[PDB]
Ligand binder design. Structure first.
Ligand SMILES: [Cl-]
Ligand SMILES: [Cl-]
Ligand SMILES: [Cl-]
Lengths: 252, 252, 252
């Protein structure tokens, strides 16, 4: 199950039923969960954790040092991750806590780049060449389409869709679809929310969207919408708007 | 000619005068044609065929499984292919017939991605980072410039130019140039057709272009243009327009 | 310090305190300077020079043949280069002198592509997936943001900023910021010049910018601005404008 050509540094912790293919690399401080597959040439570097039932594809690099001139450290990836070929997930820095963190059920396609000190939730999907700059945060179920870069310190809420062939500089309210360059909120991510919620929550989210974005001060509108609000999903939108540190981009 | 470090699984079929460099990988079901070069680290996976006089460059991956959550299978590449570094050509699925197929004389530059169940004709050129989503079809002599993604199930006719730093969602009539995001037909691909045809065919194609695209219903205009038509190249445009499944994007 | 798995062809010249990790490749004509690190899988090919204290990261390819159908040769990289993962720096051709050249202090991030016969000065920064086509020249301190391609034979002057998620076809005057697709001069690169010069030079550059770009014939304006001019930095702008071979793109 471990190819003799694999370089597993003394100190690496490997779980049950792990498969390390030829010419892969695991570091002395690496922790490879149970039932994980590391394919030919992939490199798990630094103080990096790969959770159970993850698959790291050929030549993907997890735990390389940050891309930064001025420079305990690593990457933590949850369970059931898929990291496709040539992905570069860099470690964190002392401006965070030394760690880049990814939740469970990540699906990260080829050439994807996740920069130092990112924080991705669960069930994130990154399409080919999506690039997250430093300290980007993505909520659960966010999708980022292909060839789209996200500016450092950007937050994308849960259930967002950031379209491909776009470029994102500001924060994106939960359950919204953003597109363009600079990318802006166009609508709800209707596909994502119809997959997950009932027609009733969906309609609640549509009303909430119009109530927030149609006209007026977004923060004024979010506080008002919190009044007596029944839906925890509309609440996340509202609190996210109130808490925004980079502002929200909106299309007209 | 085969480096000892190369991993050639028992079952791999290798032709005459093949060169497999260090740390490359060939599968038990792979078929490597005569006079082929597989460079260091490249991986020929699954039930994949590489035709004669092809060159697969360092770390290019041919025959990896599709990028898809819900998941006999492979990739067939014709003769005289050039596949540059870090290219990802994924196998097909049972929604096609399990195969991704590329014709002869392919020139596929670095980081290029060809998704499951694509069908590329002959003398295709893909520039750096061009990305084809699932079930994309490209006719003979089509060029796709760099950093351009094509939406799944898109058909591009023969002799098209899809410009770089664009994004393509709809079908592209043969011999046309498309550009933008969303990308649209701007003109004929005048460079491509002047390389291949005489000034007379060229002028026939220019007239045909104006006759099809100037004003009016494109399908009405294509049937009319088929009337008594002398040129097989104008016929392909017309039939392609009539047969279109995703529609044709046109600029104004 | 050299892993046994590394392939160092007889003829390779290696300096003091060099580290070649597992599965890396150095050619018979390669010259690796002192205190250089070649990480796992990276390939130094052809008649290529890597200057002292450079770091080539996992799987980066330096000295591969040009991407060109119609085809002594190599790449020369100055001291203290950082070449991140999966970068493709191709050799030159006989249309130049066979060499692609990069000065000192280069910082080249993941998936970056430098095409045949490029000439990069010192302290260049290329962000993820920046792509230089053939014969591109970049002056000292130029930055090219991420996912931006530069058209072949383009010259970018010293201290330019070419923004990310853009596409560059024309020449860029020194100390300017360019953005868009096609990308155009928007302003000075105020961040770059405030890092390097005093408030006085900065203001001189701002005046010079307005004097050159506000209205009128750019060449007429550059000759006039050369009249009695005190600043060598304003002179470079002016001479560059006068010497331009592809023209200067300017925004309105
Ligand atoms: Cl690293
Ligand atoms: Cl695979
Ligand atoms: Cl090469």
């Amino acid at each position: 199950k471990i190819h003799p050509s694999a370089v597993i540094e003394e100190g690496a912790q490997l779980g049950d039923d792990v498969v390390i293919e030829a010419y892969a690399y695991v570091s002395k401080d690496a922790k490879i969960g149970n039932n994980v597959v590391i394919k030919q040439g992939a490199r798990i570097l630094s103080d990096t954790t790969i959770g159970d039932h993850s698959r790291v594809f050929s030549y993907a690099i997890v735990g390389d040092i940050p891309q930064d001139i001025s420079y305990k450290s690593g990457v933590v990836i949850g369970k059931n991750a898929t990291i496709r070929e040539f992905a570069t997930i860099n470690s964190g820095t002392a401006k965070g806590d030394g760690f880049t963190r990814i939740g469970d059920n990540a699906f990260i396609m080829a050439y994807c780049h996740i920069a130092h000190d990112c924080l991705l939730g669960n069930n994130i999907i990154l399409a080919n060449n999506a690039t997250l700059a430093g300290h980007v945060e993505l909520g659960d179920f966010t999708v980022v389409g292909g060839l789209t870069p996200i500016h450092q310190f950007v937050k994308v809420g849960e259930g967002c869709m950031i379209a491909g062939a776009s470029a994102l500089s500001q924060d994106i309210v939960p359950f919204c679809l953003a597109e363009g360059n600079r990318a802006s909120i166009r609508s709800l991510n209707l596909v994502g929310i119809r997959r997950r919620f009932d027609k009733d929550e969906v309609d609640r989210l549509s009303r909430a969207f119009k109530t927030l974005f149609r006209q007026g001060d977004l923060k004024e509108n979010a506080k008002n919408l919190l009044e007596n609000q029944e839906s925890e999903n509309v609440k996340k939108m509202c609190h996210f708007i109130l808490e925004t540190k980079r502002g929200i981009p909106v299309y007209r």
